[PDB]
Amino acid sequence: GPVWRKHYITYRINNYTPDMNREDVDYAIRKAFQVWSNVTPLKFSKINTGMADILVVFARGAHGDDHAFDGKGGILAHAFGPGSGIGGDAHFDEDEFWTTHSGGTNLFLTAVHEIGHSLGLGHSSDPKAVMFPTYKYVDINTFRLSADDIRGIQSLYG
Ligand SMILES: COc1ccc(S(=O)(=O)N(CCO[C@@H]2O[C@H](CO)[C@@H](O)[C@H](O)[C@H]2O)CC(=O)NO)cc1
Ligand SMILES: [Ca+2]
Ligand SMILES: [Ca+2]
Ligand SMILES: [Ca+2]
């Protein structure tokens, strides 16, 4: 389906989870965008003001769209495919406990998956893929896209 028809993509962090240090939220999101720019022609830039292509939001329960969150556990986040308005936006369930590590739910790993959706990717049936619909923590310091993730994104861009 939809893809971004431009190379320079902006994102904006709407608000910050209290579960984490601010700089750590910024870093996790930045690093997750970098995963995808590594393998596509895309460039991502954080803006502090105005309309971004991808708005990053932390919210709980009903939060103004048709994708109400479900408390701790279950659904961790959801994102919209490329497009105007809410298109591209990535929402993270504040009822989760977001972290930089193996405790709680890892923000980086989740954001890699969510940004995949923000770029136009669907789910994969390969448990090795980051786009597989089940969260499983892997060491983030050595994380890598599966071949499936790479062929999926490269089918959309580059
Ligand atoms: C590693 O990063 C994540 C791993 C799991 C989740 S998750 O929060 O646990 N999660 C899984 C459930 O997804 C469902 O999967 C179905 C089968 O394809 C789809 O029909 C449906 O649209 C989709 O919501 C919702 C998700 O994928 N958000 O993007 C979120 C991020
Ligand atoms: Ca939840
Ligand atoms: Ca948007
Ligand atoms: Ca939280």
Ligand SMILES: [Zn+2]
């Ligand atoms: Zn939402």
Ligand SMILES: [Zn+2]
């Ligand atoms: Zn998903």
